[PDB]
Amino acid sequence: MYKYITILGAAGQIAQKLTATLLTYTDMHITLYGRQLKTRIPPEIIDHERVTVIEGSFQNPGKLEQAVTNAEVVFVGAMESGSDMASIVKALSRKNIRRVIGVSMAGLSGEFPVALEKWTFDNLPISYVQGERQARNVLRESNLNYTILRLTWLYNDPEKTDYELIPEGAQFNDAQVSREAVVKAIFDILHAADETPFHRTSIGVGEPGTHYDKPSFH
Ligand SMILES: [Cl-]
Ligand SMILES: [Cl-]
């Protein structure tokens, strides 16, 4: 259980859905961090009592440190850059913050079966994959109590909330997962009384029964 969460990369879709779910179903105090949030995030997610908004980029150490000051857990919505990741890890270090949950992409460790892997890496810019790899590596090299969530291909559907967790090293066969399902997974991890399964682990999140060669048109 946590009370104070800081969400980095707060304008991202999963980050916004997470914020809404935390406001509706918990008593958590939420600090949102990012560039021009008051204009990129809707009024129904921002004007609320338990939301504190701090504007800034990952290259503003002062603003970033303010945002994570007294956080009990930090959610990193986008792990796209080694540089951004190092800045985050440093800020957490300086403020004695230990617990972090971050979102990465499935596939980096060659865990997708052949066809899904080839389709995936032909439908992503190389620079994007490279940056995700570097961010992942920086976080793994830290001493943080991290949980990396390796997400397969995302889509939106409020009626799809089912997910399964795929341990590191296991073949990851699910070609898709809804953002709503990922948010449920994050919610459930935030409510885990025993954190051991999530302690410095990298866990795949997928929609059960989507063993396809590519994500569906859904
Ligand atoms: Cl953002
Ligand atoms: Cl997203």
Q: State how far the Cα of 95 lies from the Cα of 130, in Å rounded to an integer.
A: 29
Farthest-apart Cα atoms in the chain, separation: 48
Ligand with an atom nearest the CA of residue 13: 2
- Asked whether the beta carbons of 73 and 50 are under 8 A apart, the reply is no
Residue of 161, 157, 146, 170 lying closest to 218 (CA atoms): 157
- Asked whether the beta carbons of 187 and 25 are under 8 A apart, the reply is yes
Ligand with an atom nearest the CA of residue 40: 1
- Residues bordering ligand 2, an ion, CB closer than 5 Å: 12-14
R_g (Cα) of the chain, nearest Å: 17
Q: State how far the Cα of 143 lies from the Cα of 195, in Å rounded to an integer.
A: 16
- Cβ-based neighbours of 171, under 8 Å, separated by 6 or more: 111, 112, 113
Q: State how far the Cα of 17 lies from the Cα of 52, in Å rounded to an integer.
A: 16
Q: State how far the Cα of 210 lies from the Cα of 107, in Å rounded to an integer.
A: 15
Cα of 156 from ligand 1 centre, angstroms:
19
> Could you give the strand order of the β-sheet that contains 99-105, starting from the edge strand earlier in sequence?
51-55, 29-34, 4-8, 73-76, 99-105, 145-151, 201-206, 164-166
- Domains of the chain (ranges; CATH) run 2-218 (3.40.50.720)
Residue of 56, 2, 57, 55 lying closest to 30 (CA atoms): 2
Half-sphere exposure of 200 (CA within 13 A, CB side): 9
Q: State how far the Cα of 66 lies from the Cα of 132, in Å rounded to an integer.
A: 25
- The alpha carbon torsion through 158, 169, 102, 140 (nearest 10 deg) reads 180
Cα of 211 from ligand 1 centre, angstroms:
32
Q: State how far the Cα of 162 lies from the Cα of 206, in Å rounded to an integer.
A: 9
CA distances to 11, 106, 160 from 37, in Å: 7, 28, 28
CA distances to 4, 21, 56, 200 from 197, in Å: 21, 23, 33, 8
- The alpha carbon torsion through 146, 152, 153, 159 (nearest 10 deg) reads -90
Question: φ, ψ for residue 70 (rounded to 5)?
Answer: 60, 10
- Asked whether the beta carbons of 59 and 87 are under 8 A apart, the reply is yes
Q: State how far the Cα of 43 lies from the Cα of 58, in Å rounded to an integer.
A: 24
**SS3 track for 84-149:** HHHHHHHHHHHCCCCEEEEEEECCCCCCCCHHHHHHHHHCCCHHHHHHHHHHHHHHHHCCCEEEEE
Residues paired with 151 in a beta bridge: 105, 205
Residues paired with 51 in a beta bridge: 30
Q: State how far the Cα of 112 lies from the Cα of 174, in Å rounded to an integer.
A: 8
β-strand pairing of 99-105 with 73-76:
parallel
- Asked whether the beta carbons of 100 and 73 are under 8 A apart, the reply is yes
Cα of 40 from ligand 1 centre, angstroms:
8
Ligand with an atom nearest the CA of residue 153: 2
- Cβ-based neighbours of 157, under 8 Å, separated by 6 or more: 178, 180, 218
